[PDB]
Design a protein around this ligand. Sequence first.
Ligand SMILES: CC(C)CN(C[C@@H](O)[C@H](Cc1ccccc1)NC(=O)O[C@H]1CO[C@H]2OCC[C@H]21)S(=O)(=O)c1ccc2c(c1)OCO2
Lengths: 99, 99
Amino acid sequence: PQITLWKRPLVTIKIGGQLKEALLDTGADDTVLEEMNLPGRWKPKMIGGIGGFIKVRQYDQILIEICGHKAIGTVLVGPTPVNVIGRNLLTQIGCTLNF
Amino acid sequence: PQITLWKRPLVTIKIGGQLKEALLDTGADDTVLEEMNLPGRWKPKMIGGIGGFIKVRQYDQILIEICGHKAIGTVLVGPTPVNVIGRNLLTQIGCTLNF
Ligand SMILES: CC(C)CN(C[C@@H](O)[C@H](Cc1ccccc1)NC(=O)O[C@H]1CO[C@H]2OCC[C@H]21)S(=O)(=O)c1ccc2c(c1)OCO2
């Protein structure tokens, strides 16, 4: 699809077999999801945003489907205010910015 | 142009007479610029993301040229680590997400 930006670019995702809503976020290097139970091994990591740094659980090689497009990659889980889909997965679904 | 997302989508902007690098950020509702001394009236605002909130100064009807495309709108200035072009100006330059 071609998505305009007068509204938040929110899309449905599927992760861990569960449906969620997430924001397509070209300003995010990484994909960061609100706290949830997720099957897979994880390691603790720190990530910084506009307000400071938070602790997250890093899950490697996670299956995640984004608006019908399948990806497999790193998903960070922690106290983010919003589920954000970052560039690590936006590249996998072939996403570009155009103007 | 078409901008792939392998790397951060940094473009050159012109604002307040200065050339700067800024992120084309679909996850940002508002445009937020690193500390600079703009003229004119402003009002305080708090914006939140990963890590919490930062206090910023809100300037209205600011002219910004983004990769050769002119825009005018609300610009927030504060201790952000990165210059962020948000959806309020991305729509004005005709920017879409495509996949
Ligand atoms: C978290 C999302 C919902 C909001 N953010 C825009 C993001 O694109 C932000 C933009 C951002 C980029 C770099 C540093 C700080 C902010 N990126 C970010 O936090 O990404 C983190 C996750 O991946 C990592 O790569 C970048 C930081 C890490 S933001 O910068 O906090 C932000 C910008 C404009 C706003 C706002 C919040 O509230 C209203 O107007």
